[PDB]
Amino acid sequence: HMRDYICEYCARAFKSSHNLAVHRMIHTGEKPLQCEICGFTCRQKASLNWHMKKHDADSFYQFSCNICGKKFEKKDSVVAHKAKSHPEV
Ligand SMILES: [Zn+2]
Ligand SMILES: [Zn+2]
Ligand SMILES: [Zn+2]
What CA–CA distance (Å, rounded) separates 74 from 62? 9
State in Å: Cα 4 to ligand 2 middle.
27
Q: Which residues are bridge partners to 33 per DSSP?
A: 42
Do residue 51 and residue 71 come from a single domain?
no
Between vectors from CA 19 to CA 17 and to CA 24, what angle results, nearest 5°? Answer: 85
Same domain, 62 and 81: yes
Q: Give the DSSP H/E element, type plus range, for residue 22.
A: helix 17-23
Residue 49 half-sphere exposure toward CB, CA atoms < 13 A? 5
H or E, element range at 42? strand 41-42
Same domain (yes/no): 8, 24: yes
Same structural domain for residues 82 and 68? yes
Name residue 61's amino acid.
Answer: Y
Distance from the alpha carbon of residue 81 to the mean position of ligand 3, in angstroms:
6
Q: Are residues 12 and 35 in the same domain?
A: no
Same domain, 45 and 63: no
What approach was used to elucidate this structure?
Answer: NMR
CATH code at 11? 3.30.160.60
Class of residue 65 by CB neighbours under 10 A (exposed 0-12, middle 13-18, buried 19+): buried
Q: How far apart are CA 3 and CA 67, in angstroms?
A: 40
Domain region containing 22: 1-30
* Ligand minimally distant from the alpha carbon of residue 34: 2
